[PDB]
Write a protein that holds these residues in place. Structure first.
Motif, PDB file in Angstrom:
ATOM      1  N   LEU A  22      34.265  41.505  43.108  1.00  0.00           N
ATOM      2  CA  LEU A  22      35.130  40.464  42.129  1.00  0.00           C
ATOM      3  C   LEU A  22      36.642  40.880  41.927  1.00  0.00           C
ATOM      4  O   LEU A  22      36.834  41.548  40.887  1.00  0.00           O
ATOM      5  CB  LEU A  22      34.515  39.677  41.147  1.00  0.00           C
ATOM      6  N   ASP A  23      37.715  40.533  42.471  1.00  0.00           N
ATOM      7  CA  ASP A  23      38.874  40.640  41.827  1.00  0.00           C
ATOM      8  C   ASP A  23      39.294  39.986  40.580  1.00  0.00           C
ATOM      9  O   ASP A  23      38.486  39.218  40.146  1.00  0.00           O
ATOM     10  CB  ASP A  23      39.990  40.461  43.112  1.00  0.00           C
ATOM     11  N   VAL A  24      40.046  40.317  39.987  1.00  0.00           N
ATOM     12  CA  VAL A  24      40.763  40.043  38.548  1.00  0.00           C
ATOM     13  C   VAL A  24      41.975  39.330  38.546  1.00  0.00           C
ATOM     14  O   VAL A  24      43.127  39.896  38.606  1.00  0.00           O
ATOM     15  CB  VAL A  24      40.396  41.135  37.374  1.00  0.00           C
ATOM     16  N   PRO A  25      42.062  38.027  38.245  1.00  0.00           N
ATOM     17  CA  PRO A  25      43.370  37.387  38.118  1.00  0.00           C
ATOM     18  C   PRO A  25      43.830  37.681  36.848  1.00  0.00           C
ATOM     19  O   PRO A  25      43.535  37.738  35.774  1.00  0.00           O
ATOM     20  CB  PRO A  25      43.053  35.728  38.127  1.00  0.00           C
ATOM     21  N   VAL A  26      45.352  38.093  36.987  1.00  0.00           N
ATOM     22  CA  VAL A  26      45.977  38.294  35.809  1.00  0.00           C
ATOM     23  C   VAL A  26      47.488  37.594  35.817  1.00  0.00           C
ATOM     24  O   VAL A  26      48.180  37.635  34.695  1.00  0.00           O
ATOM     25  CB  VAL A  26      46.210  40.071  35.613  1.00  0.00           C
ATOM     26  N   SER A  69      46.139  38.938  41.496  1.00  0.00           N
ATOM     27  CA  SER A  69      44.745  39.519  41.316  1.00  0.00           C
ATOM     28  C   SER A  69      44.831  40.881  41.650  1.00  0.00           C
ATOM     29  O   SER A  69      45.492  41.468  42.478  1.00  0.00           O
ATOM     30  CB  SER A  69      43.534  38.591  41.747  1.00  0.00           C
ATOM     31  N   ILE A  70      43.996  41.512  40.876  1.00  0.00           N
ATOM     32  CA  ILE A  70      43.781  43.080  41.009  1.00  0.00           C
ATOM     33  C   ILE A  70      42.219  43.242  41.352  1.00  0.00           C
ATOM     34  O   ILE A  70      41.263  42.733  40.986  1.00  0.00           O
ATOM     35  CB  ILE A  70      44.213  43.813  40.060  1.00  0.00           C
ATOM     36  N   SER A  71      41.929  44.485  41.969  1.00  0.00           N
ATOM     37  CA  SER A  71      40.744  45.080  42.061  1.00  0.00           C
ATOM     38  C   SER A  71      40.926  46.846  42.038  1.00  0.00           C
ATOM     39  O   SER A  71      42.108  47.188  42.206  1.00  0.00           O
ATOM     40  CB  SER A  71      39.944  44.935  43.471  1.00  0.00           C
ATOM     41  N   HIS A 116      39.081  50.731  35.535  1.00  0.00           N
ATOM     42  CA  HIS A 116      39.162  49.361  35.695  1.00  0.00           C
ATOM     43  C   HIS A 116      39.441  48.479  34.567  1.00  0.00           C
ATOM     44  O   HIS A 116      40.431  47.664  34.321  1.00  0.00           O
ATOM     45  CB  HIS A 116      37.931  49.059  36.465  1.00  0.00           C
ATOM     46  N   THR A 134      45.192  42.337  45.214  1.00  0.00           N
ATOM     47  CA  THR A 134      44.597  41.659  46.309  1.00  0.00           C
ATOM     48  C   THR A 134      44.902  40.406  46.721  1.00  0.00           C
ATOM     49  O   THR A 134      44.751  39.907  47.910  1.00  0.00           O
ATOM     50  CB  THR A 134      42.880  41.734  45.577  1.00  0.00           C
ATOM     51  N   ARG A 135      45.532  39.687  45.846  1.00  0.00           N
ATOM     52  CA  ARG A 135      45.941  38.240  46.135  1.00  0.00           C
ATOM     53  C   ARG A 135      46.969  37.905  45.296  1.00  0.00           C
ATOM     54  O   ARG A 135      47.225  38.396  44.235  1.00  0.00           O
ATOM     55  CB  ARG A 135      45.081  37.047  45.811  1.00  0.00           C
ATOM     56  N   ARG A 145      34.939  48.612  41.600  1.00  0.00           N
ATOM     57  CA  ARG A 145      33.909  48.725  42.619  1.00  0.00           C
ATOM     58  C   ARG A 145      34.826  48.881  44.182  1.00  0.00           C
ATOM     59  O   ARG A 145      34.121  48.429  45.118  1.00  0.00           O
ATOM     60  CB  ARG A 145      33.369  47.247  42.640  1.00  0.00           C
ATOM     61  N   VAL A 187      42.745  46.006  33.544  1.00  0.00           N
ATOM     62  CA  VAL A 187      42.667  44.500  33.235  1.00  0.00           C
ATOM     63  C   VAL A 187      43.419  44.367  31.688  1.00  0.00           C
ATOM     64  O   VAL A 187      44.092  43.460  31.438  1.00  0.00           O
ATOM     65  CB  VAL A 187      41.353  44.139  33.391  1.00  0.00           C
TER      66      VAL A 187
END
Lengths: 5, 95
Positions: free
Chosen positions: A1-5, B18-20, B71, B40-41, B26, B75
């Motif tokens: 799961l990506d994380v929106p910031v 967004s990040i990963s 990670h 990522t987006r 993961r 964040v």
């Protein structure tokens, strides 16, 4: 799961 | 090839991407072996529009190193910053 910031 | 790029993004009130990844994360949709933090987006009419793209690897933010960052720490940093965030990213570019 990506994380929106 | 690769290039580094400074990217300023003004929170309104989010960064709009967004990040990963990260150490202990993961992985990422882009490179199996890399523990880095990857965009990522990107929200198309958000604050990072035209400045960031999926696959950009964040290696610094407001002067904090993101190289082999954990990670949760990445964040926490990105969410904790306010107003302007000055990123350095590594972008892959077509040969």
């Amino acid at each position: 799961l990506d994380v929106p910031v | 090839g690769s290039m580094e790029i400074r990217v300023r993004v003004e929170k309104d009130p989010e960064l709009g991407f967004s990040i990963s990844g990260g150490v202990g994360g993961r992985g990422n949709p882009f490179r199996p072996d890399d523990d880095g933090i990857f965009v990522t987006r990107v929200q198309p009419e958000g604050p990072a529009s035209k400045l960031l793209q999926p696959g950009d690897k964040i290696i610094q933010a407001n002067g904090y190193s993101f190289i082999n960052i954990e990670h949760g720490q990445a964040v926490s940093l990105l969410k904790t910053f306010q107003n302007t965030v000055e990123l350095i990213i590594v972008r892959e570019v077509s040969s």
